[PDB]
């Protein structure tokens, strides 16, 4: 009785959070995918990163796109001391590339450091966040895009992030190659 209730409860919270997100996120998902499509078109790449339950999201986004029957898109997750991402971005990133930075709270020291490295290399940033945006939100420059899930709950934020990413991939293919 309680367990079936709790399940229904979590399902409905997940669904309600997505309906809220539906009202506020589409313009930001559109701008991000556009920023990404323009970078690819100019022979740039996308580097993605995230901490913990966001790390899978960075690699899900990238593998989808890199490993393909549309053309392989140059999208690489960084993987494998808050400098782990930042150093790879300095090694790999060139002007006009795009950083996808994923953090449910926006407080990841190493994603914050990632965003500085991306700015130093003249890259645009697509930031996937939740809650109040955290420290990352405040570090975004005017040309950067923020996709902020309207929720405080870590697990609902993650659920909308997966969806957001699936939206970005889909809009990237439609814009580049066509429906």
């Amino acid at each position: 009785m309680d367990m079936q209730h709790r399940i229904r409860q979590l399902f409905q919270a997940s669904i309600e959070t997505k309906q809220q997100a539906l009202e506020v996120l589409p313009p930001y998902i559109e701008q991000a995918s556009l920023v990404m499509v323009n970078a690819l078109l100019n022979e740039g790449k996308i580097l993605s990163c995230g901490n913990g339950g966001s790390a899978g999201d960075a690699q899900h986004f990238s593998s989808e796109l890199l490993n393909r029957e549309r053309p392989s898109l140059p999208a690489v997750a960084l993987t494998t001391y808050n400098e782990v991402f930042s150093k790879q971005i300095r090694a790999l990133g060139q002007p006009g590339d795009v950083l996808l930075a994923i953090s449910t709270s926006g407080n990841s020291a190493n994603v914050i450091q990632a965003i500085q490295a991306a700015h130093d290399r003249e890259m645009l940033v697509v930031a996937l966040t939740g809650r109040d945006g955290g420290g990352m939100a405040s570090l975004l420059l005017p040309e950067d895009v923020e996709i902020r899930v309207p929720s405080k709950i870590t697990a609902r934020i993650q659920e909308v992030h997966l969806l957001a990413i699936h939206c970005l991939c889909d809009l990237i293919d439609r814009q580049l190659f066509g429906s």
Copy 2:
């Protein structure tokens, strides 16, 4: 591009979770009792999956292991890649959490067989028609099949389903 297309993807996501809500909860409940059972009997949970399911396997385990008290859940961390590790680490009673969008991942199929040889129970997160994984399941195993043929929809529901399992285990062992 199209906001209209974004709303459309969001609406499709919502609709599948609604379809999933009408069919999955009793299985989600079963799996969780199976997992709480094994953990109370001093056992453990191993998880696995390929493609867009590997992260889910890790996300489940490292919630429970790393953090509440830590719970013995380990993700198999790389067609006998998983099967070999189950043989080595599995003990009678343990649970395998196996995740696949198609039900056709050859190494998770061999993961399921290895778990059976260990006298382990299997919880299978699947979609579509359940593939070769469904046909391997024994009566005491639990399928959680997403009523969708679309990979991206199954993945979205699989993450919700994994969040539920975690929640129900903590609910039963610790309470709320």
Copy 3:
């Protein structure tokens, strides 16, 4: 002169190995019997390392378990992959009589030290691959544990002798179990 330096590095590598040859073989033999005894008693080997010692740990377990380069039976050797990430996996997976292969070049890795503690707590024996003079962790070992301490302070030379030592461990395990 770059030639002078290469031939100096090769000689330092050869010379460390020669001095390793004078202290190590008893401890390699003892380490391997411990591992063989555990496996014959239906046990398993868990292995762990940090930094450059981390390939070593994976290489050890990958070798025996997957058998990608030689055709003999698979052995339950498993590499482990926040000072508690190793501790917590050992606690979750280790059963009494199991063996931990613990690798580091300094002997000071916080997690590997805590891996040792988690191994003893689970009534496991430890084979410890170290260099320098073992320092800590090498002071945590109990009478039935085994240390293989490279007679060197140079990280690179220690890595080199570790790889050889692991190759000796795997080889004698097979030699004792399959002749």
Copy 4:
């Protein structure tokens, strides 16, 4: 201790020692040459990509992680990155090389036999991006060696024994890093 095991341990030590002594007599010119191509690439604002299969993968990641992260040693970070795997699958390296590689960059490619299809394909991808290749190999060099253009460098360990090739590879990698640091940051 018991004789056989003591015999086996000491015979392996001796074979490792003897393989290194043989390697010493033929590898230095190619090791120097390799480190020169790497240094020249970095001086021209290049980067190094590394890859390897099975037991070589560790070497690949060891090389680039030391150079880039600088845990073990406090000197400047160098743009050296290991190519990942983790979820046909023979294109995992080449797909990344085509995304990340630039004209002038260097691929350090590691294989003991030289026949792994994904490293063979990595070499092609590097060539298509106008990158130079440093190939750590053994035995006869395999298919990999057959693909090397004249600006490339091969470091072929003079052994047919996997374990022996792996040990010399680790040494080669330690020399390359030493030589890169010497040339850039002082002997």
